[PDB]
Amino acid sequence: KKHRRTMIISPERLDPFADGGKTPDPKMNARTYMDVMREQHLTKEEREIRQQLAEKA
Amino acid sequence: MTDRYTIHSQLEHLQSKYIGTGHADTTKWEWLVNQHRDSYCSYMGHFDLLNYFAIAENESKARVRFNLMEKMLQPCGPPAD
Amino acid sequence: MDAGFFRGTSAEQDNRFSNKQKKLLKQLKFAECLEKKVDMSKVNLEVIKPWITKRVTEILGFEDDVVIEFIFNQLEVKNPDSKMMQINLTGFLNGKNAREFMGELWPLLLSAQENIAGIPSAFLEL
Amino acid sequence: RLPPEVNRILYIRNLPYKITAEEMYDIFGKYGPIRQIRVGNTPETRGTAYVVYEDIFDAKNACDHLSGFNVCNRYLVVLYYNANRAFQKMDTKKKEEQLKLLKEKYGIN
Amino acid sequence: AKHHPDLIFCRKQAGVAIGRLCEKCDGKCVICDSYVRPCTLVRICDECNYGSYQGRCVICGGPGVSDAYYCKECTIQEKDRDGCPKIVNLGSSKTDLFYERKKYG
Amino acid sequence: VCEKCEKKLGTVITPDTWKDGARNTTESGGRKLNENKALTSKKARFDPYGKNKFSTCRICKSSVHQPGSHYCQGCAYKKGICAMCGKKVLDTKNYKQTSV
Ligand SMILES: [Zn+2]
Ligand SMILES: [Zn+2]
Ligand SMILES: [Zn+2]
Ligand SMILES: [Zn+2]
Ligand SMILES: [Zn+2]
């Protein structure tokens, strides 16, 4: 259960449907879907890296 | 404001369930199309209103019912927008 | 009681919330051509699939087989609802990419059903 | 032999105003090396601080002994900071090039 | 119930299952919650007597001990025709009572 | 009342909470479904034209409060009898009944 205390509140997320699905404004710094999936894939990869580099040393 | 929006969701819930309830923004056209269609259904249902209409026009009852079913599509003309 | 009885209310029971699907069918701006009806028995699908895969892959910047197969699964029914498909993709893609995406996938399926072979015009060419 | 809520970051209340940077680091640096110190500028936050220790055990010890210390004739209130949220995006491009340089360096995958 | 505005009825198409009432709810009307003049028997929809839930209370959900009726006034107004009258959500009052006793006890 | 007269008793509109041996619950059958109140109105209630007219005690001549009773509460308590039929339900040889 303690795993729910590891999770932190994410930064601001974007709403695609807001204002009739308008063209998204650049430099808004709101995460979209593809930003989220990149971060998820990137942390999976980073832990694979540390798990590999653990066994070497 | 929020009370306006909660009234709005409740009334569209009703209108889906019972076809033909209104809300504060029912137009004339909508109200009258509902009461035309309800009238047609009522005429089909009662046997003696349907007899009366089949006598007053010299038609058979099957023709009368079929014409009433044809009128159910646009009973009051096209939508007014 | 194997689960609780209480599981939340469904949308048919609860009047406190408005119908979000109808509301989005009003306010999103859909592409020009999506009103034309499509029959999928008249369309060949597996020739359509690699273009979709490639199209989604470059829009996304990576490949998501769940979005891919989701799009494919929506096209399995006989008359696919195009407006719901643009809504259901708007979350994953920009909502501007979803509009463009339907705007090219839909006339392509129209061209496919007009053919006898099942194949749209630009794919008969090439 | 530690509770899960222990953290490297400490939050400090009742800090006398315009205390020096040197005096701060000297007070908090006894328990271990210090990763970073942030001091509140805005007047609603003014007079309170965050201190990050490089070691988790030093931060544990500084909470355990630091509390109720008397600096500038006032008691010092120390707590753990609960880093419960993130304030910016994690900048996938920098993390990508960093991981590419590590993986290139050790031939991992 | 009529005393709780946030409670919600099932209202699906009722079936051949007879709804029942636990000892606490015995003798009252499911809709308007009265004690007098019982007119008609309550029928519940299929899902609401699925499985283990077969035979629980309509109004609260406890072990049912007698049959539930509509009163005469709900029959005359045809409130007995709206659907399955099983209450599908606990509501704020029931939940608050639990946490309050648990805090104390 | 005595045991044979208890079919002449009136019932309370609300059902009894102790269900066993009740006369007004659904299971007992004394609370019937689809009751028309106008048809069952004169049952076990006073009706000056009907069969239960306003009676007085046969002994003290003061008015009873229960339909179909021939003895007022005090006289029935003191003599030990059923208020409706007058059969004795209590042996009062050793009881100094006190009206106080
Ligand atoms: Zn109950
Ligand atoms: Zn009722
Ligand atoms: Zn139900
Ligand atoms: Zn008397
Ligand atoms: Zn008797």
Swiss-Prot record, chain A:
Positions of modified residues (Phosphothreonine): T6, T23
Transmembrane segments annotated in the record for this chain: none
Region (Disordered): 5-29
Compartments where located: Nucleus; Nucleus speckle
Post-translational modification remark: Phosphorylated. Phosphorylation occurs concomitantly with the splicing catalytic steps. Citrullinated by PADI4.
Record PTM N6-acetyllysine, positions in chain: K22
Residues with PTM Citrulline: R38
Residue(s) carrying Phosphoserine: S10
Family, per entry: Belongs to the SF3B1 family.
Subunit structure: Component of the 17S U2 SnRNP complex, a ribonucleoprotein complex that contains small nuclear RNA (snRNA) U2 and a number of specific proteins. Part of the SF3B subcomplex of the 17S U2 SnRNP complex. SF3B associates with the splicing subcomplex SF3A and a 12S RNA unit to form the U2 small nuclear ribonucleoproteins complex (U2 snRNP). Within the SF3B complex, interacts directly (via HEAT domain) with SF3B3, SF3B5, SF3B6 and (via HEAT domain) with PHF5A. The SF3B subcomplex interacts with U2AF2. Identified in the spliceosome C complex.
Function: Component of the 17S U2 SnRNP complex of the spliceosome, a large ribonucleoprotein complex that removes introns from transcribed pre-mRNAs. The 17S U2 SnRNP complex (1) directly participates in early spliceosome assembly and (2) mediates recognition of the intron branch site during pre-mRNA splicing by promoting the selection of the pre-mRNA branch-site adenosine, the nucleophile for the first step of splicing.
Name of the featured protein: Splicing factor 3B subunit 1
Species: Homo sapiens (Human)
Residue numbers of the full-length protein present here: 120 to 176 of 1304
Curated annotation (Swiss-Prot), chain B:
Organism: Homo sapiens (Human)
Annotated stretches, region: Interaction with SF3B1 and SF3B3: 15-76
Key word Signal present: no
Modification N-acetylthreonine, positions: T2
Residue(s) carrying Phosphoserine: S9
InterPro entries: SF3b5/RDS3-10, Splicing_factor_3B_subunit_5
Keywords from the UniProt entry: Acetylation, mRNA processing, mRNA splicing, Nucleus, Phosphoprotein, RNA-binding, Spliceosome
Quaternary structure and partners: Component of the 17S U2 SnRNP complex, a ribonucleoprotein complex that contains small nuclear RNA (snRNA) U2 and a number of specific proteins. Part of the SF3B subcomplex of the 17S U2 SnRNP complex. SF3B associates with the splicing subcomplex SF3A and a 12S RNA unit to form the U2 small nuclear ribonucleoproteins complex (U2 snRNP). Within the SF3B subcomplex, interacts directly with SF3B1 (via HEAT domain) and SF3B3. Component of the minor spliceosome, which splices U12-type introns.
Taxonomic classification: Eukaryota, Metazoa, Chordata, Craniata, Vertebrata
UniProt gene name: SF3B5
Pfam families noted in UniProt: SF3b10 (PF07189)
Gene Ontology cellular-component terms listed: nucleoplasm; nucleus; precatalytic spliceosome; SAGA complex; spliceosomal complex; U12-type spliceosomal complex; U2 snRNP; U2-type precatalytic spliceosome
In-chain residues carrying the UniProt-annotated modification N6-acetyllysine: K17
Protein family per UniProt: Belongs to the SF3B5 family.
GO terms classed as biological process: mRNA splicing, via spliceosome; positive regulation of DNA-templated transcription; regulation of DNA repair; regulation of RNA splicing; U2-type prespliceosome assembly
Entry GO MF terms: RNA binding; splicing factor binding
Site (Interaction with RNA): Y5, G20
Protein name: Splicing factor 3B subunit 5
Subcellular location: Nucleus
UniProtKB/Swiss-Prot annotation, chain C:
Processing after translation: Phosphorylated on multiple serine and threonine residues by DYRK3 during the G2-to-M transition, after the nuclear-envelope breakdown. Phosphorylation by DYRK3 promotes disassembly of nuclear speckles.
Functional note: Part of pre- and post-splicing multiprotein mRNP complexes. As a component of the minor spliceosome, involved in the splicing of U12-type introns in pre-mRNAs. Involved in numerous pre-mRNA processing events. Promotes constitutive and exonic splicing enhancer (ESE)-dependent splicing activation by bridging together sequence-specific (SR family proteins, SFRS4, SFRS5 and TRA2B/SFRS10) and basal snRNP (SNRP70 and SNRPA1) factors of the spliceosome. Stimulates mRNA 3'-end cleavage independently of the formation of an exon junction complex.
Region Necessary for mRNA 3'-end cleavage and cytoplasmic accumulation, annotated ranges: 1-126
Segments for region (Necessary for DNA and RNA-binding): 1-126
Citrulline: modified positions: R7
Superkingdom of the organism of origin: Eukaryota
Gene from which this protein is expressed: SRRM1
UniProt subcellular location: Nucleus matrix; Nucleus speckle
Protein name from the UniProt record: Serine/arginine repetitive matrix protein 1
Modification N-acetylmethionine occurs at: M1
Family named by the database record: Belongs to the splicing factor SR family.
Domain PWI: 27-126
Swiss-Prot record, chain D:
Pfam families, A to Z: RRM_1
A GO term for molecular function: mRNA binding
Protein location: Nucleus
Chief localisation class: nucleus
Quaternary state and interactors: Component of the 17S U2 SnRNP complex, a ribonucleoprotein complex that contains small nuclear RNA (snRNA) U2 and a number of specific proteins. Part of the SF3B subcomplex of the 17S U2 SnRNP complex. SF3B associates with the splicing subcomplex SF3A and a 12S RNA unit to form the U2 small nuclear ribonucleoproteins complex (U2 snRNP). Within the SF3B complex interacts directly with SF3B1. Component of the minor spliceosome, which splices U12-type introns.
Family: Belongs to the SF3B6 family.
Protein name per its UniProtKB record: Splicing factor 3B subunit 6
Organism of derivation: Homo sapiens
Lineage: Eukaryota, Metazoa, Chordata, Craniata, Vertebrata
